[PDB]
């Protein structure tokens, strides 16, 4: 701005902290079935699609299966399971950080969700009981030891 | 140079020990020359000396 500082404020020293890309854990791979832990969709099994530039995971229910739409979920608040579903046949490059900006549901968002669900339904049906497993929610029971259970 | 000297010294010591064992004659180990001392007790109730 044209305005010279009206008061003396010490300038910040040259910081040296590069914005290195996130080093995601090995367990998190595209197409892996994820389980939500906290939030409005806590305990709802979801699928992993793409890693966003804002250190967040793009996850789809799919919406037609359990009602979970394309949402951004932090990696640390997700449990990665060994099960995986083919994702090469689903287009995810379109989604980005600006896609989820918020400047009565956007029509484009619904259309993208419909396309993603159509693409991923065949892969989900490729294995028996996978759709039912995704629809079913995840909860703990007596005698369950998370440090002993295998995911 | 210092790393090479240390490696040569340790190799020579080991070789001398092995040769002494093979020859049946006792080895004359070099006397220690450096020791590190660490205080254990506190700074109270210690006799003056």
């Amino acid at each position: 701005p044209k305005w010279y500082p009206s008061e003396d404020v010490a300038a910040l020293k040259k910081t040296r902290k590069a914005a290195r890309p996130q080093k995601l854990r090995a367990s998190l791979v595209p197409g892996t079935v994820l389980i939500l832990l906290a939030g409005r969709f806590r305990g709802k099994r979801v699928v992993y699609l793409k890693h966003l530039e804002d250190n967040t995971l793009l996850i789809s229910g799919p919406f037609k299966v359990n009602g979970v739409p394309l949402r951004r979920v932090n990696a640390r608040y997700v449990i990665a399971t060994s099960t995986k579903v083919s994702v090469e046949g689903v287009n995810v490059e379109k989604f980005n950080v600006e896609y989820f900006a918020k400047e009565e549901i956007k029509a484009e968002r619904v259309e993208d969700q419909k396309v993603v669900d159509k693409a991923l339904i065949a892969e989900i049906k490729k294995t028996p009981l996978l759709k039912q497993y995704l629809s079913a929610s995840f909860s703990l029971k007596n005698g369950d030891k998370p440090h002993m259970l295998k995911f | 140079a210092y790393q090479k000297e240390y490696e040569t010294a340790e190799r020579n010591i080991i070789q001398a020990k092995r040769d002494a064992k093979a020859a049946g004659s006792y080895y004359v180990e070099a006397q220690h020359k450096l020791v590190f001392v660490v205080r254990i007790k506190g700074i109270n109730k210690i006799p003056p000396k």
Partner: protein, 68 residues
């Protein structure tokens, strides 16, 4: 199983192979229980859901069979 006193490793292994104690061990309910516990500890969430569905089906079949 029979074993000479103070047998060496080779003789012990030979006698173990001859007696086939491994086959008897597996058939016993103790080894089967160990294997079942290991398999349960090795189960996965999707495998757990499949087990739940199969258990529900088996329970339905058993209840249908019962009282008849």
């Amino acid at each position: 199983f029979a074993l000479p006193r103070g047998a060496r490793t080779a003789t012990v292994s030979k006698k173990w192979a001859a007696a086939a104690v491994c086959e008897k061990w597996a058939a016993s309910s103790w080894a089967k229980k160990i294997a079942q516990r290991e398999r349960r500890a090795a189960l996965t969430d999707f495998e757990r859901f499949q087990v739940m569905v199969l258990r529900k089906q088996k329970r339905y079949t058993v209840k249908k069979a019962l009282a008849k």
